[PDB]
């Protein structure tokens, strides 16, 4: 340079693509 | 400090287009 | 990069994927970074032309069984032929 | 009723059509 730092872990996700090809939801 | 990442941080994991599907 | 030809069963090869099939004028909408398209069973369904930002459906060029209809040989040697699931043109 | 019923039910692989 109020920012956020979160970390990534190796997880499984279930991703919902709508008609146009966009990830509009996840689990 | 600590706050809560509710449903944030999902990204297109690869180039492939898909539609109306669950993956 | 050769030219791109459509509506014939061809050996297509884009940036890193090979295949055989019919390339047709898609109408799906790729995200401006999206290259490929997979099917429900993780099989390719569309592609992005790496030299033109337009999208091509891919279809498996036709195949099927070939069945031979016949009365018993000791009735005749005449036979009919059924090409399953193909259109009477591709034969 | 047959119409209700017909509505309420929804690589080398090939599917053959039923004879009837």
């Amino acid at each position: 340079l109020a920012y956020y730092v979160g970390y990534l872990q190796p997880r499984t996700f279930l991703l919902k693509y709508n008609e146009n090809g966009t990830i509009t939801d996840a689990v | 400090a600590y706050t809560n990442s509710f449903t944030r941080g999902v990204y297109y994991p690869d180039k492939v287009f898909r539609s109306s599907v669950l993956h | 990069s050769t030219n791109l030809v459509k509506n014939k069963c061809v050996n297509f090869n884009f940036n890193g994927l090979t295949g055989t099939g019919v390339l047709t004028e898609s109408n799906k909408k790729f995200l401006p970074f999206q290259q490929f398209g997979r099917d429900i069973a993780d099989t390719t369904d569309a592609v992005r032309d790496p030299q033109t930002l337009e999208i091509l459906d891919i279809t498996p060029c036709s195949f099927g069984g070939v069945s031979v209809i016949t009365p018993g040989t000791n009735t005749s040697n005449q036979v009919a032929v059924l090409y399953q699931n193909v259109n009477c043109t591709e034969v | 009723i047959e119409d209700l019923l017909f509505n309420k039910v929804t690589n080398g692989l090939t599917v053959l059509p039923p004879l009837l």
Binding site: - | - | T18, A41, D42, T43 | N11, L13
Partner: protein, 48 residues
Amino acid sequence: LVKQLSSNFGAISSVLNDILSRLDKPEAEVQIDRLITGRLQSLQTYVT
């Protein structure tokens, strides 16, 4: 059944063409043998 086409079954890749185009026939033959055994077993499971 179709999803089983996307498995190595121990080969270096589930893509038959890539196995072919990266390795010399003595070794591509072994990798392809692993693939063939796996896919053939997938069919037998399906048919049973």
